[PDB]
Paper text:
EstE1 is a hyperthermophilic esterase belonging to the hormone-sensitive lipase family and was originally isolated by functional screening of a metagenomic library constructed from a thermal environmental sample. EstE1 is composed of 311 amino acid residues with a calculated molecular weight of approximately 34 kDa. EstE1 has a characteristic α/β hydrolase fold with nine alpha helices and an eight-stranded β-sheet. The residues Ser154, Asp251, and His281 of the catalytic triad are found in the canonical positions observed in a wide variety of α/β hydrolases.
The 2.1-Å resolution crystal structure of the selenomethionine derivative of EstE1 was determined in space group P41212 (unit cell dimensions of a = b = 73.71 Å, c = 234.23 Å, and α = β = γ = 90°) with two independent molecules per asymmetric unit, by single wavelength anomalous dispersion (SAD) method. The final structure of EstE1 displayed a nearly ellipsoidal shape with approximate dimensions of 46 Å × 47 Å × 57 Å. The electron density of the N-terminal 16 residues, which is expected to include the α1 (Lys8-Arg13) helix, was disordered. The cap domain consists of two separated helical regions (containing residues 1–41 and 193–218) and locates to the upper region of the central β-sheet. The substrate-binding pocket of EstE1 extends approximately 16 Å from the protein surface to the catalytic Ser154 residue. The sequence motif His-Gly-Gly-Gly (residues 80–83), which is conserved in the HSL family, is upstream of the active site. It is involved in hydrogen bonding for stabilization of the oxyanion hole formed by Gly82, Gly83, and Ala155. EstE1 dimerization is primarily mediated by hydrophobic interactions in the middle of the interface and is assisted by salt bridges at both ends of the interface. The dimeric interface is characterized by the formation of β-sheet between the two monomers by an antiparallel association between two C-terminal β8 strands. We also identified hydrophobic interactions between Val274 (on the β8 strand), Phe276 (on the β8 strand), and Leu299 (on the α9 helix). Site-directed mutagenesis analysis revealed that hydrophobic interactions through Val274 and Phe276 on the β8 strand at dimer interface contribute to the formation of EstE1 dimers and their hyperthermostability.
Numbering used by the authors:
A (entry chain B), B (entry chain B): 21 to 310
C (entry chain A), D (entry chain A): 17 to 310
Write the structure that this text describes.
């Protein structure tokens, strides 16, 4: 099936699946963010009604092809509340329609937009983080490298939840192991698919904005990377952390037992995803303390 | 060297090592708890001045031979504060002086003492947890099984931080792997030592109060077990969790990369120990919500 | 399988299942002789495999797997023939008595007795008594490891080398990471439930699990004959197998552990169909050949 | 070692170091002949090892390891003699040209050329052209794997089997879990710094790392000759080695991967001193023997 039809299914599936969670929150404001060639949508979650609050940029997962604001709305509500920070979930553009660079560029613009319109949003400028799951973690990681290179220091902390950091063809042992098994949640055939729908040409994969791990990782904001024991992205996510730390950037990698890829997403239904969001939040909260 | 001299060294070492952390807190009350054949000491940490607060029983580590209230005072202060619960650190009796049963019995009495004198302590009875690191995790696990068997339901949540759950002679692969390496923090020779100083006879090790994992683990309070990638107790700690969950008891096992045994203890100096205490707390806090 | 059923009928289903395996391969061997070995209470069968016709030949005692309840000389006849011809050794496969009928140390005792029988009957066998090794798979590896310990405690030095194929060396409830990981998997050839059942059929009193003749890993493994330990990546026994080789080495005995990728417990029996079973068998035969050089 | 020093002098320290290894063992072989093989730009040396004196013998091309910068026929003379006598094959060790002097595809080209030379000179060699295999360790395994791919793309079917000992199959910066874990360890025989340096000495333009003749793992591994892949538990190359066997299998080619416990990269070279190096060598010789049966 066509990417458009898998996208409409994953959406139906997820809403259908989260017609129950009730994640309380304070205010939610839906915004529009100017990007090259138009605008995108974002949703800001206010934990309280106050001034100078920390802010987190959440980039949803979905292989650069799926996912939406609504798709990770529950996750963002709980974060906002548990970390007590504003969360601006970004509806970055999706592939095969908008190919590689694009998603990465809006994620970056979003971030920038969030710091310049921060009085408005009632957010503290010197206290902003970037989080994301799967393809979102990637964007969160790349965005963090753009902020580094740019030298604007907008990112103070990062939370990579099962990031894909290597889009090359050089597989990992966990990649193959959990990509092939008869009980994964992230078929190797589907990952190779994501890649095709997103990258124009495939050496684009050797680019640092596509594969964040191939980049020099010195000089980056403190990072919290979460992994799943039975996730094909496990080795890479954990290797991302090692590398940051070896290059002088602070990193902590926590791996949850018995979990599969995308488990935080089923948090209202799996305990481990609860303990993981609770951690993400606590990590953000301490990371953004003045 | 004699157990007494290793005990005086570990103490000097730790205080010496934590002459800096400043863990703020609200009030601390040092108590005396009646046990069979005398009394023991405990230290209660108040996070705020209030009524009906959740409470956590912290059992310090040290192989049933070392450790003290002062030795894990920093850890207990931060917990209290981050979880916003009372923490009563228990100076259970230590081996070769007081051998196996004893430590386990005071840990249990402590727990009981804490629920009956709870109006006094200003603590909520229906909201109590048990936490502990290394030998302390063991005690926390055993105490949780005593509460189960007893049927009093005093324990609502448990936080096993690198628990030793198998004191038998049936080694684990991680046990051997990280017990022998040229860079562990938990020499296999020293563990075999702990065992000798604590157990009278060595089949005592096959007893459930010595080796919590050999027990049937159905019907236990929700548990959060934390492991270290380079810890000889890793496999057992993670196996403890699997077993609880297989027997119908809820459990989540999180393993931190690059860490060694006893790392939370060096939290003010290692980031991963920070992220781990932050998690312990968040786990306790959600676990004790009415 | 289904342990819901009796051991004897399960022994039958297994027997038919395994012989479809020996049927698929033609393994030449210069000769065979079915023998009857004296043990306490009678005799057990044994099949002697002759690689060539000569004197002073090296020999290998082979103990078949089957969880102490299944298996027979027939069940592992292909493995033994191939083993025999590649190492150029006399292989004698032992039909040790089975549980639940005959319970634990029996088999161990039959095994050790079969070893003494070979050394005593070496001239009649065309064997060089100073050149003997022991080998086996699953429960068979246990027997081989225990037999090596018995041979050591006795100070006779009959066992010059031991080849343990996916051996079970720990029969207590203290699980390993691999024990549970592959014991519980949906794709397991050695379910945890079946392993638990083997023990109930084999041991009379659950604390016999603590005897070294049942859980060899609990013994002092120093001073043992050189060991070659073969394990499988998805075998629940994997960890205890490697733990055993390490422990031996740490105690001064020589041991080498090899892990076959992509394999499950019992893959050697399927050698005709699985390339890896065949590579494993060739390593074993080469390991024996070299271990038995004068 | 110290890469702070030049390649040529490091090549010397290594040469002396490795020959203390060949010195420790006496490995009989019916015969040897040092030969000179024609390649683009001249000739490379090769040493032919004859196991016995006969016609129609099976043969194995052997490519020594050394990170494409070190090693020589002398450096692996013991391994080849032993390999030769245990498989009963003619082994021809190739002295392929080294980097940095001669850079990447050279060695690959020397290797493939050495393979064609053996098949063409088989009658003069007492070899059965239909029974040839290739083998090697570290960079030598790379050459053997690449040679197998070249032999396949050519459709000549010269390679009947390939034995890859702790092969390096990926020369890009995309690390594996094992690559970093053992590359950075204090107890590593293959530091990450040295691996990075080998690549700079071997490749002229860093994106050649993406060519299949350098990073065989990137090729379509379907339709290749049977593979036996040997890895070590603490080898940084461990994961890519096993990844390679799996990929081959998933593509329809036959492959078997064996992981030796407690070993580091290069343990086979130390076979005289390490029991496991010896067991590994015997598996390889047995794997070739069986793979080359008519």
């Amino acid at each position: 099936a066509s990417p458009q039809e898998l996208r409409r299914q994953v959406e139906e599936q997820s809403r259908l699946l989260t017609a129950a969670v009730q994640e309380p929150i304070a205010e939610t404001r839906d915004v529009h963010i100017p990007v090259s060639g138009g605008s995108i949508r974002a949703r800001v979650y206010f934990p309280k009604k106050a001034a100078g609050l920390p802010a987190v940029l959440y980039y949803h997962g979905g292989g650069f092809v799926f996912g939406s604001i609504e798709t990770h709305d529950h996750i963002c509500r709980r974060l906002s509340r548990l970390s007590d920070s504003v969360v601006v979930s970004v509806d970055y553009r999706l592939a095969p329609e908008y190919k590689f660079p694009t998603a990465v560029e809006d994620a970056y613009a979003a971030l920038k937009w969030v710091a310049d319109r921060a009085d408005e949003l009632g957010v503290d400028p010197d206290r902003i983080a970037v989080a994301g799951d799967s393809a979102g973690g990637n964007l969160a990681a790349v965005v963090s490298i753009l902020d580094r290179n740019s030298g604007e220091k907008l990112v103070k902390k990062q939370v990579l939840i099962y990031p894909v950091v290597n889009m090359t063809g050089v597989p990992t042992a966990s990649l193959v192991e959990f990509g092939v098994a008869e009980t994964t949640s992230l078929p190797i055939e589907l990952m190779v698919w994501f890649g095709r729908q997103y990258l124009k040409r495939p050496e684009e994969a050797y680019d640092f904005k596509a594969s964040p791990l191939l980049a020099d990782l010195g000089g980056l904001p403190p990072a919290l990377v979460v992994t799943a024991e039975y996730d094909p992205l496990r080795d890479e996510g954990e290797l991302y952390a090692y590398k940051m730390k070896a290059s002088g950037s602070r990193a902590v990698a926590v791996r949850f037992a018995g979990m599969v890829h995308g488990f935080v997403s089923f948090y209202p239904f799996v305990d481990a995803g609860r303990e993981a969001l609770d951690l993400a939040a606590a990590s953000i909260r301490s990371g953004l303390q003045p």
